[PDB]
Enzyme design. Structure first.
Site, PDB file in Angstrom:
ATOM      1  N   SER A   1       0.992  -9.356   1.371  1.00 28.80           N
ATOM      2  CA  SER A   1       1.804  -8.425  -0.125  1.00 28.80           C
ATOM      3  C   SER A   1       2.883  -9.571  -0.786  1.00 28.80           C
ATOM      4  O   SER A   1       2.932 -10.739  -1.543  1.00 28.80           O
ATOM      5  CB  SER A   1       1.691  -7.515  -1.203  1.00 28.80           C
ATOM      6  OG  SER A   1       0.146  -6.764  -0.369  1.00 28.80           O
ATOM      7  N   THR A   2       3.900  -8.677   0.277  1.00 24.17           N
ATOM      8  CA  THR A   2       5.147  -9.307   0.216  1.00 24.17           C
ATOM      9  C   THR A   2       5.632 -11.072   0.331  1.00 24.17           C
ATOM     10  O   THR A   2       6.770 -11.816  -0.235  1.00 24.17           O
ATOM     11  CB  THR A   2       5.698  -8.714   1.255  1.00 24.17           C
ATOM     12  OG1 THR A   2       6.288  -7.067   0.661  1.00 24.17           O
ATOM     13  CG2 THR A   2       7.266  -9.181   1.216  1.00 24.17           C
TER      14      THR A   2
ATOM     15  N   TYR B   1      -4.468  -1.343   5.789  1.00 22.75           N
ATOM     16  CA  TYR B   1      -4.194  -1.622   5.042  1.00 22.75           C
ATOM     17  C   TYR B   1      -5.013  -0.941   3.683  1.00 22.75           C
ATOM     18  O   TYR B   1      -5.202  -1.737   2.941  1.00 22.75           O
ATOM     19  CB  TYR B   1      -3.000  -2.864   4.745  1.00 22.75           C
ATOM     20  CG  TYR B   1      -2.141  -3.281   2.964  1.00 22.75           C
ATOM     21  CD1 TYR B   1      -1.595  -2.494   2.766  1.00 22.75           C
ATOM     22  CD2 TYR B   1      -2.286  -4.158   2.907  1.00 22.75           C
ATOM     23  CE1 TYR B   1      -0.088  -2.558   1.722  1.00 22.75           C
ATOM     24  CE2 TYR B   1      -1.408  -4.901   2.118  1.00 22.75           C
ATOM     25  CZ  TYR B   1      -0.118  -3.764   1.416  1.00 22.75           C
ATOM     26  OH  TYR B   1       0.777  -4.140   0.579  1.00 22.75           O
TER      27      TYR B   1
ATOM     28  N   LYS C   1      -1.936   0.938   7.867  1.00 17.19           N
ATOM     29  CA  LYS C   1      -0.578   0.643   6.441  1.00 17.19           C
ATOM     30  C   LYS C   1      -0.445   1.222   5.569  1.00 17.19           C
ATOM     31  O   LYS C   1      -2.027   1.366   5.220  1.00 17.19           O
ATOM     32  CB  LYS C   1      -0.399  -0.737   6.287  1.00 17.19           C
ATOM     33  CG  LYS C   1       0.674  -0.934   5.392  1.00 17.19           C
ATOM     34  CD  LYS C   1       0.871  -2.472   5.185  1.00 17.19           C
ATOM     35  CE  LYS C   1       2.048  -2.662   4.607  1.00 17.19           C
ATOM     36  NZ  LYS C   1       2.278  -4.206   4.241  1.00 17.19           N
TER      37      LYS C   1
ATOM     38  N   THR D   1       1.020   2.562   2.114  1.00 20.43           N
ATOM     39  CA  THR D   1       1.909   1.923   1.375  1.00 20.43           C
ATOM     40  C   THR D   1       1.171   3.022   0.032  1.00 20.43           C
ATOM     41  O   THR D   1       0.597   3.317  -0.952  1.00 20.43           O
ATOM     42  CB  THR D   1       1.220   0.660   0.933  1.00 20.43           C
ATOM     43  OG1 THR D   1       2.146  -0.083   1.523  1.00 20.43           O
ATOM     44  CG2 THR D   1       2.551   0.547  -0.225  1.00 20.43           C
TER      45      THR D   1
ATOM     46  N   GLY E   1       4.679   3.399   4.124  1.00 22.25           N
ATOM     47  CA  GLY E   1       4.882   1.300   2.865  1.00 22.25           C
ATOM     48  C   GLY E   1       5.535   1.122   2.884  1.00 22.25           C
ATOM     49  O   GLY E   1       5.891   0.146   1.697  1.00 22.25           O
TER      50      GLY E   1
ATOM     51  N   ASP F   1       9.143   1.887   1.033  1.00 15.56           N
ATOM     52  CA  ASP F   1      10.558   1.352   1.812  1.00 15.56           C
ATOM     53  C   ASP F   1      11.877   2.741   1.221  1.00 15.56           C
ATOM     54  O   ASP F   1      12.390   3.376   1.969  1.00 15.56           O
ATOM     55  CB  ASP F   1      11.133   0.036   1.582  1.00 15.56           C
ATOM     56  CG  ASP F   1      10.161  -1.013   2.033  1.00 15.56           C
ATOM     57  OD1 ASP F   1       9.528  -1.112   2.469  1.00 15.56           O
ATOM     58  OD2 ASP F   1      10.876  -2.248   2.152  1.00 15.56           O
TER      59      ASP F   1
ATOM     60  N   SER G   1       9.387  -4.695   2.831  1.00 17.53           N
ATOM     61  CA  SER G   1       9.549  -6.018   2.037  1.00 17.53           C
ATOM     62  C   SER G   1      10.981  -5.799   2.747  1.00 17.53           C
ATOM     63  O   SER G   1      11.689  -7.216   3.052  1.00 17.53           O
ATOM     64  CB  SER G   1       8.576  -6.452   0.712  1.00 17.53           C
ATOM     65  OG  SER G   1      10.049  -5.215   0.021  1.00 17.53           O
TER      66      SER G   1
HETATM   67  C1  ZZI Z   1       8.429   2.297  -5.519  1.00 16.12           C
HETATM   68  C2  ZZI Z   1       9.193   1.724  -5.189  1.00 16.12           C
HETATM   69  C3  ZZI Z   1       8.228   0.094  -5.057  1.00 16.12           C
HETATM   70  N1  ZZI Z   1       7.979  -0.606  -3.384  1.00 16.12           N
HETATM   71  C4  ZZI Z   1       9.225   0.097  -2.301  1.00 16.12           C
HETATM   72  C5  ZZI Z   1      10.415  -1.021  -2.202  1.00 16.12           C
HETATM   73  C6  ZZI Z   1      11.225  -1.460  -3.939  1.00 16.12           C
HETATM   74  C7  ZZI Z   1       6.969  -1.240  -3.865  1.00 16.12           C
HETATM   75  O1  ZZI Z   1       6.691  -1.828  -4.360  1.00 16.12           O
HETATM   76  C8  ZZI Z   1       7.688  -2.095  -2.430  1.00 16.12           C
HETATM   77  O2  ZZI Z   1       7.193  -3.793  -2.305  1.00 16.12           O
HETATM   78  C9  ZZI Z   1       6.567  -1.601  -1.016  1.00 16.12           C
HETATM   79  O3  ZZI Z   1       7.160  -0.461  -0.052  1.00 16.12           O
HETATM   80  C10 ZZI Z   1       6.358  -3.010   0.601  1.00 16.12           C
HETATM   81  O4  ZZI Z   1       8.230  -3.054   0.668  1.00 16.12           O
END
Ligand code: ZZI
Ligand code: ZZI
Ligand code: ZZI
Ligand code: ZZI
Lengths: 295, 295, 295, 302
Positions: free
Chosen positions: D52-53, D142, D170, D172, D194, D196, D213
């Site tokens: 996605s990133t 994923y 994975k 997320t 997934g 961060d 990302s």
């Molecule tokens: C609510 C947090 C949303 N995030 C975390 C990083 C800013 C995301 O949608 C990321 O793109 C995702 O964790 C993949 O790194």
């Protein structure tokens, strides 16, 4: 507010086979929690089946808990109703019984605005007349979806001294801790307690503490010693239990364990809750024995 | 059920300056509805602010409305609470006051199993003692999300004469009608009334009928006569009104229009509902005048 | 864009057992729609399995359909991709092939801002070089939840001449019509078509029109004549079919009916869609016969 | 479960690689090589390519292959390489799976196919078909309910991750009860966190690594969190997560992908920090904060 930090069991409200309040089992449940080394009790909450009781029934329970436990542990009275005026009557009764704090769920069913939610909290705070308020947030059940800035405003209302954060969003947990370094911040979802503490919670309020509250205080201790394996092992054992309780129905399952631990006479929740499925009774009895031998 | 078909106004509960029941305005509102030519009144529902009232306040309203209107129009008592036992008391009372039917919202807040929902309705039906039950479905507010199969079982329970369908899904409206040719089926969302009747509804229960019920009867007549332009034009005028009410807050906006119609003394809802924003009073005053010109 | 008003079939894309395009069945399916009395075709939309085809495959289909039908019925090319640049290449190809209009679904998967959506449509409109745009709205699949105000801004963008409203909310359907008296407004959910037209739609775009488009034309007729009963009967019959298609899987069920009507050689959708369950084939076969007999 | 044992070498902290573009929105190859080397020097365990990133879903298959090929040229054998090959189409995903095998990737991965509602069984066949085309490369399922619209139960997740050829999830998802449940059911499963902004909490709940990302601009912090927790140093783990979240706070305001590309632009890695349309540009007003962040990051990592 600072003295409100800790691990607080969301007290269950025992009933009899007639659906009446069982006061003898309530007294026993209160003493049982105290013996497990709990920091406090959260009374008349969602776990307490508040919303299938009359105001009078809620007050009777608040009064008895206070008789049993005032001065020995912290006591937070959940006084929330949809009505501000009903909530105010319960706040005033909590004050009369000597509670340490009051609490209210975001009023539900009807859509209210955020400003109407604030005025609601303001009214209850006034009727509590000096008791600090724990703003109670539970989107899953209440359907009230506050933004972070709205949460930030709620927690700095005059007289608010704590947030009950029943949310699995541990990003938000961290943002709240970072914005309010001194706020008492309770983890509401039992099955992520360790992680909630890591994200910034300084304690918790939970239904499952009624039967294994020493495990959750083991987690706070283990984490503070820096012993991660023990923290994880304890969370894992909590979640093994929580899996079963979600299969059986949480409140009636917890009441059933307490029945086999010789505390609650009849493990019923009020209608329309039904009874536990009887095929789950061995698992529940065995868990009772497991937990009794454990502590 | 047969004689339960029609356009029924979801009655508002008027309150005095101290937020107590305003008996005089209540009686005024009942007659005012009758003068509009409504088929009946749906009393103590969401629109009636039931969930910020005590059981005795809800009983008081039921008794007074029966006094004003029993034998002149049809009367349905919404007796639903979260507690089965509480809902039973209100049902027994509706029978005593001589209501034509009872109704109950799917119990909310706590998640209950579908069989639990079934027993809940069975128990209320026993306590109504001959009064038909109107099952009241409103996912948006109640958080309960029934499948069609579950809807079909509920509506075929012994003693169920009707379904209040407060849903915008008009595929499901048609499916329900197709499965149950003779069920009384009330359109719940005022702003799709025309479309809802077209999809298979044979009437409606609505909050906005309190101030323009004759428009909804006009939509029924027009569709009956194959008079589609007229139906559409009436629905459009209803929706112009509904746009504004959604802006002001629906219950309090309705009460404010009724206040300028000389029916309601004080147009307040119960806390935590706040007041109408002052900027909207010209618009609502205009609306009052127009509807009085009309007729 | 008054000339775009009507009942348009959302064309299916036929494939062979190797999953390649079946161009002979495509040509046959086009002529079949034309013979049915349809007003136009909507090519390479959701129903057309656009999102499991390459741009070149999508272009090959748009070209074939223009060869078969240009000047005979109206032709709308669905050119939307998540990528703006990819959607522009398709918008250019549609113009070269002599389409009457272009269309694009709100770009999906990644959350884009509303302004980002507006620029997306501007760029496609530019590449379309004079072909009017049909804004394609389908919250349930796209995950893009526009407000009414945002919808109003999209539909008045320069070069937009229509809205494909794949929404079950017939209040919003009325509000859009009321704001935009001359807008071409397509009902997207085949199972509420009659109710959609009553609320303010002036036509439809639908997958099931491929096998019974004459029924939807009969609904428009019946309602123009104020014959509500025929309109209801036709919609009920459409919904019996839609109930079955939902059980079998919709696109593949449609393709199977078409296979029994001797139009589609191989009734497959592309992987990861699987084949129809063989227990449904007798029902799909009886439906084909029934509809062939009806004409 | 033997496929879980065999994928043990995939455990770790892997950056979800961004795809740099030039002024005309074509692949910027020089910047990609730089970004890749830049990740390696941070001490990252590996790269997750074309997710996605990486803006996969606004690229063609041919563009995705080009990126896969270039990243293999740059990093094969030096760090672990996972190829996100997932499309809505099974056959498109299979083409990318074969390519990834040809270029020497360590693993493939596919997002649950989206837009159209597919049954669970149709999901399982999709993963099986792609596993067949990957020709010995292990599969990383994923799971991203927020963007995919696919809402799998735990039992369904249990079945997916035990399909033959699967060796990692994975995850997320912000549901850390489910994170713990997955770990308890699958003791040897590679389990990437997934989101961060909850990394430290995800690890505590049962994840044994992460894909993210923001690792492109501060991957050593996440390695710092893993080390701190291994040693039982909770204060250091919490302080690092807090700093990551101050940074995530900013990127959510700017737009996450374009905000990351801009920081990398000020770190001299990426030449032009644009995303592909319909993504728009970063707002001018955020540039000071983003440069400030680039400076702070180059400071702390000397
Ligand atoms: C609510 C947090 C949303 N995030 C975390 C990083 C800013 C995301 O949608 C990321 O793109 C995702 O964790 C993949 O790194
Ligand atoms: C969907 C999770 C519901 N839960 C968690 C089970 C422990 C609850 O309602 C709990 O009672 C809550 O965490 C408060 O203890
Ligand atoms: C959101 C639309 C407003 N409502 C609900 C009343 C709060 C309506 O239009 C319905 O008609 C309502 O359920 C009762 O008439
Ligand atoms: C969820 C099924 C509703 N429908 C209508 C089935 C005929 C659809 O999703 C259609 O594919 C859509 O309305 C296009 O006709």
């Amino acid at each position: 507010a600072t003295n409100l930090r800790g691990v607080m069991a969301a007290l269950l409200t025992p009933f009899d086979q007639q659906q009446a309040l069982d006061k003898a089992s309530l007294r026993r449940l209160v003493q049982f929690n105290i013996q497990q080394g709990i920091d406090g009790l959260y009374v008349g909450g969602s776990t307490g089946e508040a919303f299938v009781q009359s105001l009078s029934e809620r007050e009777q329970v608040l009064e008895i808990v206070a008789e049993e436990a005032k001065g020995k542990i912290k006591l937070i009275a959940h006084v929330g109703c949809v009505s501000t005026a009903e909530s105010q009557q319960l706040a005033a009764s909590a004050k009369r019984y000597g509670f340490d704090a009051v609490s209210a769920v975001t009023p539900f069913y009807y859509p209210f605005s955020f400003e109407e939610h604030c005025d609601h909290y303001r009214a209850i705070i006034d009727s509590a007349d000096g008791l600090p308020m724990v703003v109670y947030n539970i989107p899953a059940l209440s359907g009230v979806k506050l933004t972070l800035d709205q949460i930030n405003t709620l927690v700095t209302l005059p007289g608010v001294g704590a947030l009950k954060q029943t949310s699995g969003d541990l990003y938000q947990m961290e943002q709240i801790r970072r914005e309010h370094p001194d706020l008492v911040l309770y983890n509401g979802y039992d099955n992520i307690f360790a992680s909630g503490l890591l994200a910034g919670a300084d304690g918790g309020i939970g239904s499952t503490y009624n039967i294994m509250g020493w495990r959750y205080q083991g987690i706070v201790k283990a984490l503070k010693e820096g012993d991660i394996q023990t923290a994880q092992k304890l969370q894992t054992e909590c979640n093994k239990v929580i899996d079963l309780l979600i299969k059986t129905g949480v409140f009636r399952g917890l009441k059933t364990v307490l029945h086999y631990m010789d505390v609650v006479s009849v493990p019923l929740c009020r209608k329309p809750f039904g009874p536990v499925d009887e095929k789950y009774l061995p698992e529940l009895k065995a868990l009772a024995q497991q937990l009794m031998q454990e502590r």
